Write a protein that binds this ligand. Sequence first.
Ligand SMILES: Nc1nc2c(ncn2[C@@H]2O[C@H](COP(=O)(O)O)[C@@H](O)[C@H]2O)c(=O)[nH]1
Ligand SMILES: Nc1nc2c(ncn2[C@@H]2O[C@H](COP(=O)(O)O)[C@@H](O)[C@H]2O)c(=O)[nH]1
Ligand SMILES: Nc1nc2c(ncn2[C@@H]2O[C@H](COP(=O)(O)O)[C@@H](O)[C@H]2O)c(=O)[nH]1
Ligand SMILES: Nc1nc2c(ncn2[C@@H]2O[C@H](COP(=O)(O)O)[C@@H](O)[C@H]2O)c(=O)[nH]1
Ligand SMILES: O=P(O)(O)OC[C@H]1O[C@H](OP(=O)(O)O)[C@H](O)[C@@H]1O
Ligand SMILES: [K+]
Ligand SMILES: [K+]
Lengths: 322, 322, 322, 322, 322, 322
Amino acid sequence: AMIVKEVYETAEKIKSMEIRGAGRIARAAAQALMIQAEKSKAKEPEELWNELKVASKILYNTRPTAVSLPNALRYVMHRVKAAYLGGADLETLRFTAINSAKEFIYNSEKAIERIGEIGAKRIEDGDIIMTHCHSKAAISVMKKAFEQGKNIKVIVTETRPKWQGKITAKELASYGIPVIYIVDSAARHYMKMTDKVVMGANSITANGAVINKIGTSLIALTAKEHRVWVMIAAETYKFHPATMLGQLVEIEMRDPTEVIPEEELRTWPKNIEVWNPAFDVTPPEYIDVIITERGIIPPYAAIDILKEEFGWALKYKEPWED
Amino acid sequence: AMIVKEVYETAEKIKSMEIRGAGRIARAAAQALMIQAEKSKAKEPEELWNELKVASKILYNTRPTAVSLPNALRYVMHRVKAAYLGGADLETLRFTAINSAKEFIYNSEKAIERIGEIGAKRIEDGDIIMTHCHSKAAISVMKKAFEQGKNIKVIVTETRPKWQGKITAKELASYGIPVIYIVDSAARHYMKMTDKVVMGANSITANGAVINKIGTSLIALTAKEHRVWVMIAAETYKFHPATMLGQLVEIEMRDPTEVIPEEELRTWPKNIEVWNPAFDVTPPEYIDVIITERGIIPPYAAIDILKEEFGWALKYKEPWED
Amino acid sequence: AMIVKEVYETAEKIKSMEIRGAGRIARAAAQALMIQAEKSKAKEPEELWNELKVASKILYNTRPTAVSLPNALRYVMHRVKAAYLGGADLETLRFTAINSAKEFIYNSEKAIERIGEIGAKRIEDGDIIMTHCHSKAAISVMKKAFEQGKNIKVIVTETRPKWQGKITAKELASYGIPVIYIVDSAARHYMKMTDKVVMGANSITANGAVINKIGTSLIALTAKEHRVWVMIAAETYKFHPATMLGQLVEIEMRDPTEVIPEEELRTWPKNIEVWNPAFDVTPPEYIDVIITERGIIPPYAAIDILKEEFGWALKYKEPWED
Amino acid sequence: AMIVKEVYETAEKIKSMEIRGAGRIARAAAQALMIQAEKSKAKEPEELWNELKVASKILYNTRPTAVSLPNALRYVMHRVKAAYLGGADLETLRFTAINSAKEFIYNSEKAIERIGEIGAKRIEDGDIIMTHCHSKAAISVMKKAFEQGKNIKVIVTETRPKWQGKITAKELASYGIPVIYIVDSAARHYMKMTDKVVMGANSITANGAVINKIGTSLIALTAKEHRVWVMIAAETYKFHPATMLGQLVEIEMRDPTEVIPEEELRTWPKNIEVWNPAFDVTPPEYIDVIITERGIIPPYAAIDILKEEFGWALKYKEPWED
Amino acid sequence: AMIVKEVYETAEKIKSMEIRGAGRIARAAAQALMIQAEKSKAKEPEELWNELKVASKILYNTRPTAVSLPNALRYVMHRVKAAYLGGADLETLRFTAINSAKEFIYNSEKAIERIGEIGAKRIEDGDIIMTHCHSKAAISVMKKAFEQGKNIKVIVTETRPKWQGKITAKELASYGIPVIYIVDSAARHYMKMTDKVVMGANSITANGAVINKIGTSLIALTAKEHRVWVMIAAETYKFHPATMLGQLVEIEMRDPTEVIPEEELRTWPKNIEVWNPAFDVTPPEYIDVIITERGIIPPYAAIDILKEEFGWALKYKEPWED
Amino acid sequence: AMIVKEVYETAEKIKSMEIRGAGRIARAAAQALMIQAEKSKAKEPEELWNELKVASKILYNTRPTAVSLPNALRYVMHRVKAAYLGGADLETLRFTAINSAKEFIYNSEKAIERIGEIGAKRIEDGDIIMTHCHSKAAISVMKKAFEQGKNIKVIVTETRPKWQGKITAKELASYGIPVIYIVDSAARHYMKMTDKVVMGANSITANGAVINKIGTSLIALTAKEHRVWVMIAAETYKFHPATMLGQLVEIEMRDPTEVIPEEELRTWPKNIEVWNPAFDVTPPEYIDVIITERGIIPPYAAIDILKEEFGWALKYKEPWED
Ligand SMILES: Nc1nc2c(ncn2[C@@H]2O[C@H](COP(=O)(O)O)[C@@H](O)[C@H]2O)c(=O)[nH]1
Ligand SMILES: Nc1nc2c(ncn2[C@@H]2O[C@H](COP(=O)(O)O)[C@@H](O)[C@H]2O)c(=O)[nH]1
Ligand SMILES: Nc1nc2c(ncn2[C@@H]2O[C@H](COP(=O)(O)O)[C@@H](O)[C@H]2O)c(=O)[nH]1
Ligand SMILES: Nc1nc2c(ncn2[C@@H]2O[C@H](COP(=O)(O)O)[C@@H](O)[C@H]2O)c(=O)[nH]1
Ligand SMILES: O=P(O)(O)OC[C@H]1O[C@H](OP(=O)(O)O)[C@H](O)[C@@H]1O
Ligand SMILES: [K+]
Ligand SMILES: [K+]
């Protein structure tokens, strides 16, 4: 019942995309569970457990499509449930919460680094790399390859409606990496000069499909058409365990006003419908590798990642549920 | 030289895309040679011939990619040059020019209406049609299909950078046609629900390729992927003579600020280049039919349309040349 | 008003498929117009013309999909109309009818022969040929190749629902050609041992698609997948002129009882719907050549055939119309 | 040797396909070793072990392609052989056999229900699903989807020669599900309206190929063409151990008269051979997922299912061998 | 007949490939017809006609695959035969042979020079160009583009067995064009860096296939795979008129000693057969353009080139026949 | 260190390719480590360790592309290093080197013999088999299938530049297998008649790509094109462990004199560069199976072979390092 103000604030900021990026929203939800445990006023273990269940729900019900977020909450809450059920007292429960969130947030940082170090080995001197949206994991790859002294260049697609290519362009330029900035429709037109495509992921499924920013699948299609390697930089917590048992991943339909600003859109007639999918599905046949913190896999090995690290939990209900 | 106001105003409105659309700029270019010949104060054929030569040059030197523009100038000036070299006095030459240009304008209007009637027979009741940019020819097909009582819906892509899709969406909604407005990036995601794709052309080459608004090649590519018919609606003067003797069509690179506004681009680091190609090249394999005003063709029959209608002029210079 | 009994009988037999095969039903409709003219009791030219208009309609409204039939009727009726309108008397009109039908029927026979002679040159000694349905034009090819002394073998697909493979099997066996008879679902399974596919056509369209017996498109798909040449044996009157101006070809939906016999089908519940398309469309990308009486063309040249021999008539309404 | 009536009656009902379906014949084969051990009058382990050996041989030697049958025999007899070689007395061995076979039967029933629950999550409301033959596993998915209130329709292919599609259509219509019944040949024509394909398996090989009813490879091929998901519903005992060490799966050639009835075939010329393969091989590339009772896999993960569940037995002989 | 030595030397040097290339050998058969006529000791017009018919057969029976050679003999002998049947006296006939030969020889040189100018327009500055064998038509494109100031590099495949890549390497190096020389097997490895492919043609068939040096089809395949333009530079006399009536082009099989020298091959055992096909067949779908002296065509308009230039001649027997 | 002559002779004969094949050179580096140990004059365990580390570096720096060679050196030196760090005395260490070498050499011979038996099961009587270079693993499949009584023929591509096809041709002819010998360029021409492709492998990466003799990827491409199985016969020590952490496999570039002999090359001009890549990269989508000594895997499970056998070793530095 008694939820801190930071949990609510994190939720509002994830919903609104003030905070965004699959990896970042996951860390932000771990963080919010950390703070709820730190600042809790509860006296019983039962009453902390109840606050953590509710803050978890509040954070789960922000954005559907990126499984990183649910996975972050599970990382904490599996550990919190097993403590509460194993009979821990208040402070042992509170530490379990805080130190689990801390581990996740730390593992997320190290994994993004390691993904960089590993993807970079596939970038050769002189490469022209196309990317899409703004993915920390993809950027960690391009960044490390530059620092290795490879003279790379990155074709950045503006990525409508939310324009996150701008973020990517300025970030890459800031490290000294030259950028070619283009609208999304130019991807095919520039694929003939591209050597590598490198993008992120919000969720990766049992059969190896990659759910990522709207337009990703298009870029992968023409990449394949041209024999340009498509490389998906993604952490193991981007892999989606409900899919092993048949679950389809919800594609988030965001507000039409992101596409057409409110002032303008109110003047349009009723029989125009603005549709704003935030993600699309890229089939595994159009992906050459997925680069996780544990190494290069072909996308069809997504099921191995899911088996060895998440399978166990699918016989149990969700670790924030009553 | 002594060129009329309306030749400069038209040429600069083509340049700024205040007047746009491959058809319309071709009518506008004819309409301007027309007003030059109307208001010319020359007192001698050779003086007016020289006026019309120079007005043509100015109109050619505006935008390069849509061969519709030079085909319109060719249409007036092949005739004006034949009359002048024949011996025509002033009023004969003036009438030749004025009338030639009226023919082209009337023929362009009729050709478009015709393309709509033909193309609409390839549209079936219940069809969801995806389009791109704003093409009068493609709209003619859609409009006509709807007037025939086929219950259609058109998926309109916004069409970055210049947003012509906004025009398309308001235009079709105003004729009664339900519109689904999406970003260019969503073309693959929504290709599964799409029955037909209907797009325009700016240039059609000898070997069947179609130069049309940037992103056309992506839509076409993924339409092939999904076995959706790609129909290109295009008047015969969209077809490109010079491609018969090996000519590559230039792709217009327009100003970076169409993508990133001036107020913002000036703040961006020097090592980001913004690249804004106005068109791309869709290869023939991804096109099912080109609809002309003389009927349905496979795209590899573009050489026939050009052999029969344009071939004769390629042993000559341009009809505005010294 | 006064229509002979043979016209009605031909119609009933075309509807029912007692007479069948694109080529044969065309000759049978020429024949029926022949007999109506031969036996007519009319005294005025106006009154023969009126009987021929009506018998033509009766024959047009038998089966939609095979354009051979409409083309046969036009071959006669274009010539009859131009005579009647040019002022011919009764007997001159009657001869024009009879002798036009005679020419068509003769040209049909010679064309099927010539198609044989030309297709056969593409059959090599030892070839294994898959066919589908029963096509005289396809059979003329296999037959001639055998008589040339090539030791061929033909995989005949049974061709459901109407089982016309049986006809093909017995006919080929009768000339001494060995046959492998298979259900339609085995086509892919046996494509690896097949050297050539050779099928007929009911209608061929402007952009080069081939409308032929249901299942043709499937056979062509896997043929292409395997690099097995697909050869369509077809007369110029199989080419469909309404398509040059955008017309879609009606696919005939025949009686469900052809699939499931009446005795049985009456016992099935209402929420099962038997659907019986008689034809499908094979796209031109899956056809290597069309073999007409005038030679080998790639399917994209279907528009050339249509242009040079049928284009002229599309400005006029139908030559049996009032 | 002394074999019970029910072993012969079952073996000959498998042979005649009076009992058919890869699952069902596997349950039937277990059910027969069960009834042998029940009613055996042996008074000594070695006598009963020899009875069960010989009953197994007889049951193996019925139909070769569906590895479900020998996996069922392996399931009983690996256990029966371990007990006998362990020293088990008569009643221990008899119980081992009787109970082993009951386990397999209970597990097969549960596995199928489970596959339906998992697979139905990949089915969406409004989906038109095309199926082939009659597969209990595929039907489980469809049935379950419908019980979940997804408004579906199933296109059922009749499935020549043996017409199993009739069974499928009456079965789904009797649970309330609207059915569209078509011939195998119409699969491509109706693939454009199809959202999902759901088919069963008889054998799944190490490299991911799927041996299933003849025609499956065509449906799959053209589903890929159109980007329709191909889902194969298959229990883990449909997976084929021996393919791990290079074994080609034999394709069952059944009797010509299943195609052409005896009354008719006897009248046909000697130079027609009728070829009736019962199955074909769909390669992994054309399959999106295999749905097992342990979840969704890419088809290239069939080696994992076999490494983990079957690998150990390949250094041994069959558990019925001398 | 009294056949001059120069005819027998030309045939010998064509069989041995001392004189080679489809154009070159065409010119050489014209040259030799020209010399038969110039040096003939024939007193009567009957006697010269017979000497030329015989010289023509001799030349035709050297190398079957390149149609250029017989098309040359036609050009002369069609004209020599019209003269003779029209009743020409001796010196009239002799001159017709001589001036027909000289016409063909001059047109060949023009056509090749003009293919250069047309083709060069498709080469863009910076281009890397892969070629195969030694084609004068291909070399004229590459040479002309270099003379226009475009910095190119050419990847010359060595072209086994006869090593003609060596002739091409030295030839392009001698015009100042940098060459990269590689074994045939490396064509795919280096296709990623290739911008354009440019090759010649020995015969081009009615549906667009290009018969050219063994290996041409593999380069074209991987070229397509990587979306690299494949351009065939071919005079109109390489188009194969017999193919319009279904004829297959024979693939010349040459001595096994070209592959393994005789010192070595004689030691090898009998159960090694060495097969040396001199040409293969590229299908039209892997060819983007044929460049002829009259323009750029898609491969599918090869039939138009044939209909309009050689199609007349197919109803008559070969000029040199009686 | 005191390195024995046999180590320096082995390195020299590996660089010059006098000893070649990925397996063979692996065994030869083991053999040489074995001889360093056998003939060592080292009085102390420190001194032998240093002599082996140095001999290992020498052997590693011969030919980079074949991972078999370093994987052999690992097998020994991992074990030699465990002994030394565990504190082993001299003769303990020396034996560990000798018995580790002998272990690897015996396992290699077994693995190849066993690949033969597994692979042969996929060869079917009548098969025509195309191969490339000279692979002992591929040859063992083909040999074993012939010894099983299956009548096969093998198409041996000559494999330029080093002509290893000659070694394969004589070798298979010597077991009584008929060979068809052809230039590399003819692979597509003869793929129509080929039933199976069987080739070796120098390294196999984490996502399934196969690095093998230059040309391998072209054969695999056209094989895929024609639906011919491509089978890679490769021991588990050809799988490349460094690729799991993103490393790219280096392509050895060898002397240009292998392509053009020095007598001739010295005469050629400087602006001809001769490039001699020894390997190319076949992507996994063009490979149907890898045959290892432990079974058949789809190319996408190369990662499982690596995880389960070599994955442990990646956190440590190379055994021969300090
Ligand atoms: N749409 C969708 N596809 C998924 C999901 N999980 C896995 N997939 C797989 O992703 C692929 C999508 O291919 P597409 O339909 O884009 O051609 C399918 O093969 C499907 O099996 C999911 O949640 N949604
Ligand atoms: N369905 C249909 N397609 C036609 C017709 N005429 C021409 N076509 C062409 O045939 C092709 C059919 O391809 P599909 O949809 O089978 O992939 C299309 O590209 C279409 O333009 C017609 O009457 N009906
Ligand atoms: N082999 C061969 N193919 C020819 C010839 N003329 C035309 N073709 C055409 O060339 C193509 C060969 O394609 P492939 O079978 O190599 O994939 C087909 O479209 C075929 O119909 C000829 O003389 N020989
Ligand atoms: N060139 C190269 N490709 C590799 C290597 N390791 C794995 N690959 C994979 O091999 C494939 C090469 O395909 P290609 O670009 O030839 O079409 C890709 O899937 C790529 O990601 C390596 O070391 N080099
Ligand atoms: O002639 P219509 O069919 O209207 O349009 C033809 C094409 O020309 C336009 O170019 P732009 O907007 O002027 O750059 C668009 O690319 C459009 O599809
Ligand atoms: K669709
Ligand atoms: K569909």
